[PDB]
Amino acid sequence: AQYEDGKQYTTLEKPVAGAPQVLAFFSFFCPHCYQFAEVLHISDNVKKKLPEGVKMTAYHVNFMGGDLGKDLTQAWAVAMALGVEDKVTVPLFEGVQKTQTIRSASDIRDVFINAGIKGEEYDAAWNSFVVKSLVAQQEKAAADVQLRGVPAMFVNGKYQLNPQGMDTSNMDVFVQQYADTVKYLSEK
């Protein structure tokens, strides 16, 4: 008795086959997503508690931020294909919401260059078929879970995290409950 349907998580009435084990949706434009990444470190605490062999996957979404938003979804596809997610997450969140220095496709690419990805490697990745495929895959996954806002996280294409049923008086306690719920669900 400590993780309950309708409280810490909910059950998709419309389950999704072939979904990533643990699938997070976020936007670099989203203040809640910045809170999750930069203050709560949700993703990192989830990974710390996941059983062995369960992976976490994170997709960017487009319904925030207009054309930069779409650029950032493709830039995230680049990050996924070059395996540099953890080098650009922080400079992108801060670039968008904290200093607001990211305001065109060009400023996104600079974040990557300053994180070590050579400009020309970024460009090839940007125009590649694999990145195009990953942009469409992020979009297909969001439609498939009928995504209406971010942040959000889904386990085995069946369960949705419900932070609204979680204690938020203590940030550390919130983060452990959330991470413990993901771990619990990954084992259902």
Numbering used by the authors: 1 to 188
Wording from the paper:
DsbA from E. coli K−12 (EcDsbA) was the first and is probably the best-characterised DSB enzyme to date. EcDsbA consists of a canonical TRX domain, a hallmark of proteins involved in redox homeostasis, with an inserted helical domain. The TRX domain harbours the conserved active site CXXC (C30-P31-H32-C33 in EcDsbA) that is featured in many proteins of the TRX superfamily. The acidity of this groove originates from a cluster of negatively charged residues (E24, E37, E38, D44, E85, D86 and E94) that map along a buried channel in the interface between the TRX and helical domains of EcDsbA.
The other three mutants, E37A, E24A and E24A/E37A/K58A, were crystallised in space groups P21, P212121 and P2, respectively, with four molecules per asymmetric unit. The crystal structures of the three mutants containing the K58A mutation showed that the shorter alanine side chain at position 58 significantly expanded the size of the entrance to the buried channel. In all three crystal structures, a glycerol molecule, used for cryoprotection, was modelled into the electron density. However, examination of the three lysine mutant structures showed that w1 was strictly conserved, forming hydrogen bonds to the backbone amide of C33. When E37 was present in the protein structures, water w3 was observed to form a hydrogen bond with E37 in both K58A and E24A/K58A structures. Additional water molecules (labelled as w’ in Figure 4F–H) were modelled into the electron density in the buried channel in all the lysine mutants. Conversely, introduction of the three mutations, E24A/E37A/K58A, resulted in a less oxidising redox potential of −139 ± 1 mV, 14 mV lower than that of wildtype. Modification of all three charged residues (E24A/E37A/K58A) led to an oxidation rate constant of 5.93 ± 0.16 × 105 M−1 s−1, 3.8-fold (380%) slower than that of EcDsbA wildtype and the slowest among all mutants. Mutation of two or more of the E24, E37 and K58 further increased the “disordered” solvent content, reducing the structured hydrogen bond network between the charged residues and the w1–w4 water molecules.
